[PDB]
Amino acid sequence: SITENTSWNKEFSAEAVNGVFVLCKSSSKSCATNDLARASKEYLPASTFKIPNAIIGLETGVIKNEHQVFKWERDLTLRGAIQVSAVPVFQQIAREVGEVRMQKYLKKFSYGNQNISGGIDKFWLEGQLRISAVNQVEFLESLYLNKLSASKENQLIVKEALVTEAAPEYLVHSKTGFSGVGTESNPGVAWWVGWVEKETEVYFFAFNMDIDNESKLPLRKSIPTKIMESEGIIGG
Template sequence: MIPRFPLPTLALLVCCAVFFHLSPAASAAPTVVERPDWAKFFTDAGVTGTLVLLEDGARTVQVHDAARAAKGFLPASTFKIPNSLIALETGVAPGPDTVFPWDGTKRSIEAWNADLTLTQALRVSCVPIYQELARKIGPERMKWWVSAMGYGNADIGDAIDTFWLEGKLRISALEQAAFLQRLAHDGLPLSKRTMALVREMLVEERTANGVLRAKSGLTARVVPNVAWWVGWVEKGDKRWFFALNIDADHPEALAARKAVVKTVLASEGIWP
């Protein structure tokens, strides 16, 4: 059974469904172009993985390791993006400044041992708070929204508070970039308010020249570990969407996530 929604939300869902069904631009997949020259950035960082770079309006998507870019992996904490969207849209979290009190349990990540707003919880990637959100959303609504947004294989399984960490949910780097592009352009079946709030929550860097929005992730509960960094750059009316995942088989790999992406962005004249 589909969860009940207010009439304005239902109308928005219908409009979005019609648009994406009828729009040739929305359904036309860009051509994948391999960038073997990017291999040196991965080699220099000592990591193995893939990177997708999608520019708005381009007929091609540039990729290092196209086979891996199409392979689904657990999203880990990059799922905090759709989790935030769903929590805000359903009212489970009324707004980005909603405070979640610390439960008093001491955890190894010190930043988690405090009262946090939703925005702060996203930025420090606080797993317990997002598990609480998922439980409050509940399996039925979560399954419906993940499917409605077209997020990866949309398989949330049976464990409502761990499915993105060690469950069956899978998403590829290509799918991550496409999902973020829809979020950037109000192309998800959600209110514009919700999407605007989450876009602002994702701001990682803001300069006079543009904005970098991003989220990291690490599949720390499974072997082999995979580390993510996904997001996009905005400069005026131009946008470039990126999604990287790498094998996180040594401690230095975590820092390499951002380093590889930023090196590629700099080589392409995109960021900073």
């Protein structure tokens, strides 16, 4: 069940932006958001698509194993290619997977509008593919639980590649995305999605915002952090 917390709008206003945050404790049955309408609106996933693309890459055999090196401006591991800008790597993966297989996996994953038109190597960046913050949480929860239609091994491999913060009792798996800086009337979209394991609890999250100014990009992390901090998740 998802509920609306309009008091969270203060954190978007303060900084002057239009966006949404979805935060779920334990499971996607217990979620809250600043804006119910926008929580279900679908946007270009941009680099958040590397999550399903890597899983599909591994399942189809296009990516050999966790230790494959993607050789070149620099050579990258799977983790490095996900965490850094590595355009050509994932373009090459998508072309190798192919449209029929890509379409079949997005069906199995219930990934957004499942519309991959616009070119096999750019549909998630300039094409027709769209996904909501709610659908991102649902997808990430399935991954967490090894419930996607993929081997547990491959789900595990991608999950370690997504670790971004680590402490003994606090672990964060996450991924950013950004379609580009658009204009005030035709803004781009920026994302931060993932999950936080704090002690024995887990929190799934998905954030997106409209971006029409290059200087606003860091808000994709700061706004969610501030909201999570207010919920008591960050530290004590």
